[PDB]
Structures are given as C-alpha cells and as structure tokens.
C-alpha cells in the first residue's frame, strides 16, 4: 500500500469515579480533563467544573455516581460525559455573523475506552454501551475494570492491586491481564470515610475545631497558635445550600489529609502499649484553616488514619447512621481474604508484584505500613511494591492503564464495533 | 461465543498482550517521558537566560554609553561657543 | 538542511481504513492517506 | 485446532498496525549552543527606529518641545524656544468636605495649653535655639561687630507690648482679589479646579469649599496626603493637563500629539516616579516623544560647564552631585530632606518664641503661608554685618475680615533660621518620613521581583550612616535604610559627596572643590554662596587655597539655570535619548533602559 | 542562514515578525471581510465595513473557520512582513488545551498551502513564561477572547490543572458600553465599540479596595476624567473607570456564574502536586492585553494572599512587555540553535502526514 501515515487510532479514554472523572486521548501520560463528579444545579441548568461551583441563590450540588462507584443517574452521566468528550475534547462550531458584534454526530473518529469498578453488575454494563452507542456516533467501544488498568499502569501482567479511592477501598488479584473474580474484596474504609474521621476528631477536641470554607472569608490576619482568628466573613442575601457548604468544606479536609495526616508506619499497631505515649513526644505538624485559625497537631494526626488498619482505633461517625467499620473491612483483612481466594501456587508471584493505587494511598507512611503488615502476615516471602503511573504523579492510575492499553496494536482486534453492537445489543456479557 | 475455541483465542490474545506488549510499551513510555521532561527543562533554562540577558552590564555597553554621554556634552559646549559668540 | 528549492510536498487527505475484530466483524476508522510516492 | 477456529470465523490479527502508537521522543543535543536573540541593533525596536529616524533626517522645531521641571513648591514649564520658563506653584484646588487647615495640627507645631514655653515649643528645640544664640554672639564678638546686651530684651518687650491697627477698606493701599470659584472655566474643559497662584488665592471660606493638594513633597510623590495610588496619579495628571492648557495656552487637546517633551528628574530618582511621568506623557497626553535629564546634568548644561559640583537648594530638598564627561558621577549623589521651607517655618517659630505679635499664625492656612514666604524673602540673611535690633511692619489681609497692620521687632531670628543648614536638628524633621511607601512600593527588578532596582550611591549611604550606624536579604537592607531620613549639615554633605566622586584621588578633590555651583530658590538667601565657602574653608584648612563657591551661571536666576539646561538638551542634534510614543506602546518602561544617557 | 517567522494569532490581534527581534513587525485585527451581496483583512476590512460581512476566524483562542484563518496567514506573509514563506521556518502558537484535530489542520496548511520548509507549534502560556525569565510558575494569560490559568513545572505545562475563565477583553468592552448607556450616552454600533475600546485602554483602572472606591467616588473632581470623541463632542466617566475591570474579580456584576481570576489562579495551584505549590505562588506571571489595567498586580497580590496560607510567599510578576510576552517567548525560542532539531521538517511531513505534530510538538 504505502498510502498511510503515523496516524493509527485516536482512542478516547474515560475514567469516572465518585470524587473525580478523568478524560483524554490514549498515548498520553496524563488526562487532559479532570473534573469533580460533584456538579452544580441552579435553574434547570447543570454546571460542570471546579471553576463553576460559586455562591448563588439557587445553587445546589449533586453527584451522578453512588458510593458503590457506579453511575446512579444516567441522564446526568450523559450530560457530564457530553461536556468532557464533546465540548472540551473536540473542535467547536463558529458563532453566527449576526451575534459577533462586528456587523451591527460528534465522536465519529474516536473509539471510546470506558473504565468500570470490578463489582459493576451486568445491567449497568448493558446501559453503558446502550448510552454510548445511541448518543455519540462512536465507531467502537470497550469497557474495562479499574484493577486491570492499574496493573498495566505499573507495567505488570500479574499483580495484587490495592486501590484506596474515595468511596471504596478494593483488593483484587490480576493474572495474565484478567481479574480473578474470586479474589475481589471491597471496603468503605477509604478517603470519604477518612474525611468523616477527621470531622469527628475536630468536634471531639477540648475547644472544638470548626471548619469554615474559604468562600465564606473576605480577608484574614495571621494569629498565634490556639488564638481566636482575626477575620471578617462575607454575607449573602440568599441562604447557602447545605450541599454547597459540604462540597466547599471537603476542599479544606483534602488539604488536611495531604499535609497533616500521617499513617503510623512504626513497629506494631498504633495502640500497642508504648506507641501513643511516644507519639505525643514527637514534633507535630502545623495547619491553618481558611479563617486564619492555626494549631500544632501531635498524636490525633496518627489516630485518624489508624482505623483502616485497626477497627478499635476509629473515632465514632458524626452521622449516627454510618455504621462503624468491622475487622473484616480493614486493609489486612481484605488482603488475607483476597489471596485466600487464589491458588497457593500464585501467592509468591502476586505478593512479589503488589500494585498500590487510589489518591488515599498518597498519605505519609501508607506504603511503609502496608509493607510492614504484608511482611509480618506472609513471613518468608519477598514483598515488593509498585506505583501505578509513568511519573511521580500517582493520582491517575486506571486512566494511564487505559492510555497504554488503547495504544497497543494487538488491542485493536478487541473493540466492539458499531455494527457488532447493532447485530447483538448485549455483546458485552460475552466479549468481557 | 459459548465455546472452548472462542475462550482459548480470547485468553491467548490477553496473555500475549499482558506479558509481551504491556511490558515493552511501559518501558518505552517511561523512557520517552524522561526524554520529553529533560528536553523541555534544558530548553526552558536556555530561553529564560536569553529573556534576562539584555540587562547584564558589559565592557562594550559601558564604553558605548560613556561615548554617547561625552558626544552630547561636547555638542552642548559647541552650542554655547556659537550663541555666546553670535549674541 | 532545509528545502531543495521549494517543490511541493505530497497531499494528505482524510480517508477510511478497514479493520477487523478477532470475531471477524469488519469496521471503518477515519485515517490520513496520501497517494503512493514513486 | 486452528482450522475449527477459522471455520467459526475466529482469528487473531495485527490489523497491519505497529506494536504501539506511544510517541518515542528523541533527546535534544544542547551542547555547543549559541543564540541569535538581540545580538544586532536591527533586532532592537528602539535602535531600529532610531536608525530609521537618523536616515529620514539625513536623506527639529523648538516651538514644538515642551520643557517641564516639576517640584515641591514650584512647577517650571515652557517651550524650548522660550527665553524663560513660566513658573507656578505646583498645587491643585478641588471641592472637598474640609480645608487642609481643618484636617491637621497648626504649623509651626506647638503643644497649645502646655505648662510653659519650654513644653509648648519643646525642651530640646529651646535648648538648641539658646545654644545657636550664644554661638552667634561669640562669633560676631570675635569679628568685633556691635552686641548691645539687651538686644533680645528690646525685641521681646516691644513684641509683647504691641497690638494691631485695623485699616479702613479703601484706605488700605492694596485691595485683595480672591479667586472667584463660582466662575465657569474657558480653557476647553468643564471641572471647576484651580492650579498655581489662583488656587493659593482661594478664600478659606468660599461658598463651595476647596482643599489644596500638593502632589510632590520633600522631592518625592506626596503619598502621605493621598488615600490611594489612583487619586495621586489622577492629580499629577490633572495639574500638568491644566498647566499645558493655562500656562502654555495649548487649549485644543487633539493637537497635543504634535508636541515632544523634556522632563527634568532628580539625580537620585525613584524609578516609579520616572515611569509615572513617561506614562502620563504618552498615554494621557499622547505626546510624540519624551526625554529625561537629571537636575545636576541640566544645571551644568545651563552654565556650559564640562565638570562641576552642583548644589541645588530648594523648598523641600537639597541635592549635591558631581558631574563629569557627560555623566552624573553615580556614587557622589546626596539628597537631604530640608530646604528653604524649613527656613520659613524655623523663622516663624523663632519669632513666635520671641513673642511675635500674630501668635495665632498657622502655615497650613493659605494667607498665613503667603505671609510667611513674603516675610522670609524680605528679612532672612546670612550676611552677619547686617545685624541690629530692627523695626518693621506687615499687613495681615484675610478673607471677609478687615486689614490689620502689625508693628514688630527682630534681632537674630533672621540669621539663625538660615544657619539651620549647618545644624539641621533645629528644623522640624519629625513627620517627613510619614507615609514614605504607604501607596507606591520600592522599585524591584522586572524579572527578579525580590531585588531592589532603585538607584544607590556610596555618598548617600555614608550620610545615612551618620544618622544611624548601618544574613539580611536585599529587601531587609533596603527597608532598614528607608526607615532613616537623610539629614546632614550642608558643609559635611558637600565634602562627603566630593570625596566619593574622587574615590580618594586628591587631584580630583582639588578640581571639584574649585567648581561648586549653587542653584535653586532656597539658595537665593543673601550672602549664601560666600557663607558656604567660609564654612567649607574652616572644615578643610588644607583646601582653603582652592575652595571656590559660585551662585548660578551666566547671570541667570538660580531658579531657572536647570530649565535653561533642559531646553538646550532639547535643541542639540546629538541627543538621541528620545523614547518615541510607538516604542512605549510595544514595550513600556523597558525602552527607558535602551535610550537614556546613563545606566537607568 | 535566515530567521524563522514567529506568528502569534489571537481572537483580537495577530502579531508577526522575525525570530531574534525583541518586538513584532506587524500587529493587526484578526478580522476578515467578504462582500455582503475578493476579500479583505485587518484594518482594510474595518475601513470598508459598510460593504462587507465581518467575522473573527478565532473564537475563545481556538480557530473556528480555516478558510478565513488561511486569509489571515496569507495577509501576514505577503502584505505585512513582505516575505515568501517558502524560504523561512515558521513558529506558530496555540491556545492551552485546544483540540488535537486543529494541530493537524494547521500543520497541513503550512506545508500544503504555504510550502513552509520547517514548522513548529508551541503553547502560548509556556512562551510567556520564557519571556518572563523563569522555568516554573503559573501564567494568568488574559487577552481579547479567553482567560486561562496555566501551571508549568520545569518547562512542562500541567494540562489537568489548566482552568479557563470564559471571559476577557471583549466582555469588558460590552460591559463598559452597558454602564455608559446607564450614564445617558448612546453606544450600540461597531464604530462606537472601537471608541469604547479606546476609552477602556486609557481611563480604566483596578481599585485596591472596591467597596472603599465605591464609598469615596460619591464626591471627587479628580475621578471624573473626560474623553473627546472623533466627532469632537466630549464625555465624562467616573465610577465606570474602576467598575469595568472589577468584572475580572467579580464576574457576577457581568451576569456569568464563575470564580474571578484570583480564585481560578488559587484553584489551578490546588490541582497541582503539593511539593510544586510553593514554587507556583512564588512565580505567578501575568500575560496578555487584559492584564495591562493600572493596579492589577497590586490587587492580585492582595486577593491571592487572602486565599493562600499565611506561610506562603506570594509574588506577582507583571513585566512592562507583558502584552507581547507570548510573541517575545516565541522569538527567543525560534532564535536558539536548538530549534533546528525541534521543528517538523517537510521531509517528516511527506513521510508521516499531519499527525507528525503530536509526536514532535509538546
Ligand atoms: N494527596 C492526597 N493525600 C490523601 N488523600 C488525598 C489526596 N488527594 C486527594 N485525596 C483524597 O482522595 C480521595 C479521592 O481519591 P480518587 O483516587 O480520586 O477517588 P476516585 O477515583 O474518584 O474514587 P473511586 O474510589 O474510584 S469512586 C478524596 O477523598 C480526596 O480527599
Ligand atoms: N528672593 C528669595 N529670597 C529667599 N528665598 C527665596 C527667594 N525666592 C525664592 N525663595 C525660596 O525658594 C524656595 C523655592 O525654591 P524652588 O527651587 O522653586 O523650590 P522647588 O524647586 O519647588 O523645590 P524642589 O527643588 O522641587 S524641592 C521657597 O522656599 C522660597 O521661599
Ligand atoms: N493598555 C491596555 N489596558 C487595558 N486593556 C488593554 C490594553 N491594551 C489592550 N487591551 C485589551 O486587551 C485585549 C487584547 O489583548 P491581546 O492579549 O492582544 O488579545 P489576543 O492575543 O487576541 O487575545 P487572546 O487571549 O489570545 S484570544 C483587548 O480587549 C484590548 O482592548
Ligand atoms: Mg478510583
Ligand atoms: Mg528644584
Ligand atoms: Mg493572546
């Protein structure tokens, strides 16, 4: 032939999650578009992007994902994915000449690779291809599991994937690029739960600590540790919605997690007889709220993280409905329960290839604790840990795996075609 | 679809894809990213030096500026030698 | 070096490329194409 | 197996693709590199446009060049073709809730209803006035002049035992004209604002109420009196707009694009003030070109001197600089925050202490300010032989109140207020530094936003070290110096400025000391140049054979030598220092660096 | 050897000139005209507007008609710069996060329509950073059509952290016309838009405390500056002088639901890696024409200091040349000897086609 260029297939890679949704082209080291899964609603209008959430009279904040990490609202999901894949990632249309002030289907070129949670039920998978083929004129589709992509993001065929997200923590064994369905184990003890631990720990302090989000503060002056804040608040004609207020407080909690909170990495559990007493003698870490309020954090820094390793250590939920985590839902329990679901021959292979993923896994000391716990519970095996990702940036794991996968030449025989769908209607069940 | 033949092909494609292709393309991508980041960093070091260099004082610059200043001052002495002689 | 003495490049155009699934179904992806160079 | 899979139609395939589309970036070689950026003058917009202009010339009208010399009491303005500048007070009157007199404590400063005069004037000041009196007596006794022991007693007793005479409205020899603030303007503009002499002659109790704004004080932007940077910039713009309309008669603004401008700046300039002036001229006035010359350079160009030590004594600033080979000697620059205005306030305070009749005088009140300037111009003198108990009178004329005549006597207040230039602790220095960076920050490098870019000199640091002996960053060192007000005796300032100019070369000290030139209105006190030469000669007896101080040059007024020099700089053909309108629209303040005739 | 051309197209103004120069040779409006019932570009099209339909081919920084865009490049080479592209390498610029299809489409036009011997595409914000004399920072780039915030670490932008306030220079002209109509002047015509643009670029400024300038504007003879129309009649604008640019910091006043430029800058820093953020606050760089309002940097230093922690050392960099920082960064790049081994050669285009631009231009 000799008629063709370097052009082969430009695939779109889509990765929806309870906190974040990420979109981009395959063959690229990071997603172009990353937006909250929380979206604004005002006056029938839906508003997407961290930049469009701003105090207004009608403003209410919603999510199109449930805490099962699955789509709850396919209407809203279609509007969010239209925004990312069509408005942000394709060419625009021009404005009319009458409106410029001087004079007085959309995805037909790009097949779509979509990421699902490993416990995603078949009715949901059927609705994903139904929604994708009907709305967008996509040529071809693929639907893959978060753990497989995280293992390919670490450059691994066979791996044990620990995936500590927002809504869920998961453990799963991948072998020869496929999920061992008996190995899947899941837990609420993840990032959203860690925010509830922090909120609880703040309301338990001797003088209570009150979070007030940045949007409510006009101007602030620096003050000494433990002093009341020199600060002046905004006021609004309208009452602020509880959902908006909550979404804006979660930015402050995420800044507390990335900078104060530390996993106890030391010898044995944090509640062993010497450990908490020693923790109080260490230097702390300082933190400022948007109000200017300022304090040094010593041992509470450790105690908020410990609950996902030891169910005894956890603070009570401030929500009286959200039941306490059980021994079976801790990370060491999920690991033991996951490898007990696998052939004894594979265990040394899997534990030599531990792959860690999910933004909650970025806490100070997390890998050090995980390594120690694996080493003590499987003695006499070589344990080694791998980051998902090409770079020191580890917030995207599954998305980079999709990017590598959809760029392999051998993969292009896998896509479900438009024609292949039109002949069958539920091709997914048998093609994955 | 529901047969040992189909299952064998699907599994054999994924085994080769996972073991051979994913391992090669991850090494190529990680090296490629390190080259891209290195290329860009060193370029930005050159371009940022150029943007500032017009400010650096030099032997040539100072002598040319002493020469500009001395010509203007000799033209002011000329000006008076005409007007103070013609008035 | 740079150019010979101007002289045009070969034209590229959005064509279509037939490609095949492992289950034998054939589908078309848009792709850049050029006429064969002598 | 295989043929049963093929019979079912199942077959694994390359699709003719490469192993991967993932991009393989080659490493750039960065060794042995060179650059082509701004290597040739044709690549620099400023210099290209100058070369184009020089060609267009070879292959300008003085009446089209405005010459501006702003100041803290007086603005001097004219066309370069003019023999002399138009001079007006650099002040602006606008409508406001309050007058300048209502907002602040009276001047000179007195602790009213204090226990005693020693508190009312302040004990340190009273001790210093008594020291200066005793030193003057010893000095003029050594010179064998007359000193009657009761000289101060005659003055104090007469002033204490004397009262004013009210004069009938028509029997007054000079009926005052106050500015009619109600009158519609006729200068192609509508806002009822007044500039210069018209603003000073607004009655304190006009029907709409006016405040006077002085946008420059102590020789820098008067940030203290303004609430915002926007208000200060809007007023220096408004003052110069009205000066072009009202002093130069340039009534049609659309025609201003055909004029160029020469601006005189201080030798220790603030880069923010230079960049404000260039922005006024090119963005608000739309002039064709602007050029800058430093006060000391312009002074020598007025004279026709190749090499000189220039002392410029003004209302609110005194500056010393040496100049040589077309450049101000960058290390020699000294800049002291006193002038002839201090002499007015010190004279009024010394006389008030000596029971001067009009105890209610307040130099924040416009008629009292004009009276104090007039008194100071008549009587203050550094010729010691003129001194005896002297008797005189003045007319207090005040709005909507009948003219009062005061007889008064004085003895030595007339010499001791000037002699403050050799002990400047007698001047009220207490508030001069208030507001110094309140609205407008220090100049920092365009790129390296931590490093201060305002000029410095060895001599001005040597002066600050006399006031206050002075790892810290460049901002900490700068902020530490900004806290010290530069005050030194004028004889010490001159000899330190010259010592830094010569860098220890005795032969350049001898040349510069024989070349001292005095200018500015504060120097216009009688016998000032002879007095300064005597003071230098007793401080350096080794140089007494060669110290030579001169007032003005080529028979000009001390107040216009600098403007005459600026107007010659406009005219002479070798001056390529012009920043054109278009350069500035492209590159802003950056073109100053390209075009000025010193390292900006 | 000959210099590359550097071309910086924009929703408002095209800039063009030779690599190694410190400023463009040519600047003209990105306007094309066709007969209502031959074609014209820039101020010739503005002049003849009575018989033309006038269009902007670039919208919010993205090319939206390639027919009109090709006329603008044709004008730039043959009428503005007076050079044949066949002799010179060409550096073009592109808006942050613009579509991959458009990078291919411009790559085709330089090789197939102009026969450029060699070519490159570069991200505007990164050029502006090189001009500002640093390798790491965050660029607020605000022009006629769009305002972007772009984090950059050691010469590499961070596209997931790029935020885009969809409001800039034109929106403030339309707002200034609306509030001058509320003061009783008449403004609703294209000639009148060019008048009001000239008012905005002279009389407008950014208040350091907006509620206190509203409080004090009630009486000030200093505030009420005035302006003479081409007709010779005179208009006088007061609180409108600082109300117009306040729409950058409070887009609510302009009737759109978004964070202002100070909040969007804070948000972009807070999408980056924690170890990077100190270096972003210490290097906030301002670029583009809409950043030229007096007092803007001083308000940015105050506004970002209110959001940021008390431990952070916020610095705003706004150099004098900042309306042309994108062009200047282009000129510097395209004048490095290293550029010869960074461009797409027309041999690579012959073998690889339009998609070569993704392999070679980052
Ligand atoms: N650097 C950080 N350190 C610790 N926690 C972080 C950090 N950055 C973000 N988080 C938390 O990470 C959680 C989100 O993690 P993600 O990996 O984005 O979750 P996600 O992928 O949307 O969640 P799922 O589980 O896939 S539905 C939130 O609860 C954040 O508060
Ligand atoms: N005949 C005179 N006798 C005594 N003092 C005089 C005389 N004429 C003017 N002055 C004083 O000169 C001072 C004004 O000097 P100028 O040089 O005009 O000041 P200025 O330039 O506004 O001050 P700078 O240089 O900007 S600080 C005033 O304080 C006057 O009182
Ligand atoms: N001095 C100034 N003060 C205020 N606004 C100005 C000034 N100069 C130009 N502008 C405005 O800046 C805008 C043009 O800015 P540019 O950055 O050149 O536009 P551009 O490059 O076309 O814009 P984009 O962002 O690239 S679409 C117009 O709205 C002008 O009115
Ligand atoms: Mg996740
Ligand atoms: Mg003066
Ligand atoms: Mg632009």
Author numbering:
A (entry chain W): 13 to 116, 139 to 466
B (entry chain G): 722 to 808
C (entry chain X): 160 to 197
D (entry chain U): 6 to 64, 101 to 511, 618 to 747
E (entry chain V): 4 to 40, 51 to 375
Please quote the paper that reports this structure:
INO80 is a >1-megadalton chromatin remodeler that is conserved from yeast to human and emerges as a central multisubunit enzyme complex that determines chromatin structure around NDRs/NFRs.
To determine the complete modular architecture of INO80 A-modules and to gain insight into their interactions with DNA, we used cryo-EM to obtain high-resolution structures of A-modules from C. thermophilum and S. cerevisiae. Structures were obtained either directly from recombinantly produced A-modules or as individually processed and refined A-module classes in cryo-EM datasets on various INO80 or INO80:nucleosome complexes. The A-modules from all three species revealed similar overall architectures and conformations. However, the cryo-EM analysis enabled us to define two functionally important elements of the INO80 A-module that were missing in the previous crystallographic analysis, the N-terminal extension of Arp8 (i.e., amino acids preceding the actin fold) and the Ies4 subunit. The resolution of the maps allowed us to unambiguously define and model the central part of the Ies4 subunit and define its interaction within the A-module.
